[PDB]
Amino acid sequence: EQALHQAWQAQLGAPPGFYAAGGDSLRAVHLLATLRQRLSRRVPLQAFAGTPEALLELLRQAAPGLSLAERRLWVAQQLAPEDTSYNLLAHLRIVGATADAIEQALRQLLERHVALRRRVETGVDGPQPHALAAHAVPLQRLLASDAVHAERLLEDGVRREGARVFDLAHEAPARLLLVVTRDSARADLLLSVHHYAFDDVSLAVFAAELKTLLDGGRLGVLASTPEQVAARERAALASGRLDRVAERWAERLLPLAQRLALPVSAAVHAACRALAERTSVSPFSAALQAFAEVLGAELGVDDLLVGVALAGRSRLEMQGLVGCFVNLLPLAVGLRPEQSVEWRLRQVGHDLLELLEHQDVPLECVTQALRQRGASGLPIRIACGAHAGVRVEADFIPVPGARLDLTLWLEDQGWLAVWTGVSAIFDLHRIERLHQAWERRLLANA
Numbered sequence: 547e548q549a550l551h552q553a554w555q556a557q558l559g560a561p562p563g564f565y566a567a568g569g570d571s572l573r574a575v576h577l578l579a580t581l582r583q584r585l586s587r588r589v590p591l592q593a594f595a596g597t598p599e600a601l602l603e604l605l606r607q608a609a610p611g612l613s614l615a616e617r618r619l620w621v622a623q624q625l626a627p628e629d630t631s632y633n634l635l636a637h638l639r640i641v642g643a644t645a646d647a648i649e650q651a652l653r654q655l656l657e658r659h660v661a662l663r664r665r666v667e668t669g670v671d672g673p674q675p676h677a678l679a680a681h682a683v684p685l686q687r688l689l690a691s692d693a694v695h696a697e698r699l700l701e702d703g704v705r706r707e708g709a710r711v712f713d714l715a716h717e718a719p720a721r722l723l724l725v726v727t728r729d730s731a732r733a734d735l736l737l738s739v740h741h742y743a744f745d746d747v748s749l750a751v752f753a754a755e756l757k758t759l760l761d762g763g764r765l766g767v768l769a770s771t772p773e774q775v776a777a778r779e780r781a782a783l784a785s786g787r788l789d790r791v792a793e794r795w796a797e798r799l800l801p802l803a804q805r806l807a808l809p810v811s812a813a814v815h816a817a818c819r820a821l822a823e824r825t826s827v828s829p830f831s832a833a834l835q836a837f838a839e840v841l842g843a844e845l846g847v848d849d850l851l852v853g854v855a856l857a858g859r860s861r862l863e864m865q866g867l868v869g870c871f872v873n874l875l876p877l878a879v880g881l882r883p884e885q886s887v888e889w890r891l892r893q894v895g896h897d898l899l900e901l902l903e904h905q906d907v908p909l910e911c912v913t914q915a916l917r918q919r920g921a922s923g924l925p926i927r928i929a930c931g932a933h934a935g936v937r938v939e940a941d942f943i944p945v946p947g948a949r950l951d952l953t954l955w956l957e958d959q960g961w962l963a964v965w966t967g968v969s970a971i972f973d974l975h976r977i978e979r980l981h982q983a984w985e986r987r988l989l990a991n992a
């Protein structure tokens with residue numbers, strides 16, 4: 547106690563149900579990771595996120611190479627060396643810093659985040675990273691004569707970096723373009739980086755730290771590295787702890803074994819939140835339920851496999867890292883008309899917290915567990931996810947094409963619904979129809 551208090555306040559910006567108080571499932575994980583790092587006690591997420599009082603009771607009850615996330619992107623690239631759909635492009639808009647300051651801050655960030663400056667060799671028991679010097683990361687600086695010229699230079703960069711095949715064995719997996727505009731405080735940075743070396747949270751980390759440096763602040767020493775994360779995972783794999791979770795999930799899973807960005811209507815947003823609070827699940831849980839219900843009806847099945855995209859940063863020391871930590875784990879959604887909306891939702895919510903709790907279990911363990919019970923693999927086709935001083939704005943430019951047949955990503959800008967389909971299966975018009983069905987389903991469910 548007085549530590550539950552501290553962690554709760556740090557997360558929600560106000561003292562002490564967690565969801566009722568403004569919380570979500572991800573903040574809940576972070577709360578518990580903070581408590582675990584302090585007090586050396588693991589409260590399971592299901593138990594908690596399934597009040598300050600409930601958490602206090604749970605606390606008292608509680609006892610005192612490349613990673614697979616990196617490797618699955620690296621391997622995918624090796625199987626299709628000319629495929630550039632693992633190239634991430636981030637455009638950072640910076641107002642109030644000089645070109646020299648930006649460049650110096652970028653060199654510091656490159657030195658600090660080794661993922662941005664390694665080469666990878668093939669290796670007998672898996673790929674092997676080797677660090678390069680920060681100076682080995684290309685950084686081109688251009689002066690634009692005006693704001694429109696700067697736009698043209700950026701668009702040129704986008705096209706060039708989008709088409710670039712990274713030589714991951716000999717060069718850093720990152721490239722920087724800095725465009726400064728004559729007689730303006732605005733600078734533009736295009737970070738081009740291979741996906742094996744970066745992810746969504748990494749951009750937020752990179753941009754926040756860039757701003758700190760440009761404001762004249764200092765960065766703390768990092769509590770970990772990608773290689774250490776990988777080593778911990780090698781140990782957890784050897785120990786069998788990850789495989790035992792996967793084997794349990796395999797049981798329930800065995801039977802089953804073009805971009806459009808639309809604002810979510812205010813009424814659908816409210817419906818979703820109401821439904822969530824009534825059932826003590828996350829708003830995302832409600833959104834996911836409706837997605838599964840709609841896709842289930844469309845495809846004409848009683849049970850649907852839905853991938854859930856997870857940040858995969860299970861420990862406090864992983865929160866400030868740059869690298870690829872993302873994981874995708876399967877959820878089975880039964881479409882059972884006999885059960886209440888509320889009960890189906892509570893089940894979805896609980897299965898979600900289960901995946902989140904165990905987001906350190908790599909997809910490959912689940913796949914393996916399924917093979918050991920006779921299935922060929924795990925055919926996930928559909929997925930769901932959610933995303934003073936110098937001004938720094940950072941945004942990914944979406945990757946074209948699609949590995950999964952269809953995904954829905956919810957962005958907490960109201961909400962924005964981003965649907966991405968394989969054109970040959972889910973073209974624009976079909977996605978639009980699915981989006982409308984999804985909105986109607988949420989309203990109905992509420």
Ligand SMILES: *P(=O)(O)OCC(C)(C)[C@@H](O)C(=O)NCCC(=O)NCCS
Binds near residue numbers: 572855856857
């Ligand atoms: P909760 O049920 O409110 O939220 C669900 C979630 C924890 C899975 C989600 O909020 C989350 O963890 N998002 C992180 C995903 C990310 O940053 N990267 C995925 C890109 S592939």
